[PDB]
């Protein structure tokens, strides 16, 4: 009832599911399955053809991803209502909110939950990293890790959005990223900051008053003050391994998965 795939696969409805960054999520339907989906539009966007092709190629690889800890990506394309331009992404419908919304709601997390969810995130990342070629997310944060609800597992999401960003408050990022340098280890750094935020229910570097201060500290290897508040020894140890200044000296994902913390539960 308003939009439809060029084939006829997915339909769009007028129900809003919420907002991200002027990116509005409509409710949708996959007729081929009778499964409800997320119908995503980025309100007003466009760019160049090499960049366009780059998105198109990478996007096509997303459609072939199937993993329990990754949000399923269905399809994408550009459109112009009147009027307004946008990119449309169709993804698995996640209704049960994010880590970010969870933390904002409760402001505390049990250790058993943190262990299980952090393992799931690592398994997601390792799946992406060991595609051919590797997929680096490069924009991991609490507000694009989604909770399922059935089984209350987590999935990494906004793969389409991340691809767009890669094709070309915003934030702190690993030190190398300030020099637009990255490999797999940028996702490890982001993991570490996600785990810190889960363990403390604080946004890292909240003591800093401007980006510049954060830049200075991050590139210096000066840790956020919230690091000092972590109460669980093994969690603190894991976070420290992940947010080391030199990307080459950080824990690998294999290192992390093999940590005793995750052998506990």
Numbering used by the authors: 211 to 378, 386 to 482
Q: Paper's wording?
A:
With No Lysine (WNK) kinases are soluble intracelluar serine–threonine kinases noted for their unique active site and their association with familial hyperkalemic hypertension (FHHt). WNKs are the chloride-inhibited protein kinases long anticipated to control the activity of cation chloride cotransporters in response to osmotic stress. WNKs are activated by osmotic stress in cells and are inhibited by chloride. A model for WNK regulation, then, is the presence of a dimer–monomer equilibrium: the dimer is inactive and binds inhibitory ligands; the monomer is autophosphorylation-competent.
Here, we present crystallographic data that the osmolyte PEG400, when applied to crystals of uWNK1, induces de-dimerization and conformational changes. Remarkably, PEG400 induced a space group change from P1 to P21. Together with the space group change, uWNK1/SA in PEG400 monomerizes. No PEG400 was observed in uWNK1/SA/PEG400. Prominent changes occur in helix C and β5, with the largest change occurring in the Activation Loop (including the preceding 3/10 chloride-binding helix). Furthermore, PEG400 induces a large rotation in the 3/10 helix and neighboring helix C. The change in the 3/10 helix eliminates the chloride-binding site and gives rise to big conformational changes at K375 and E388 in the Activation Loop. The water network at the dimer interface, CWN2, is completely lost in PEG400 with the loss of the interface. Data presented here show that PEG400 applied to crystals of WNK1 rearranged and eliminated the AL-CL Cluster and the associated network of water molecules, CWN1. Comparison of the water structure in the inactive dimer versus the PEG400-induced conformation suggests that water functions as an inhibitor, binding and stabilizing an inactive WNK configuration.
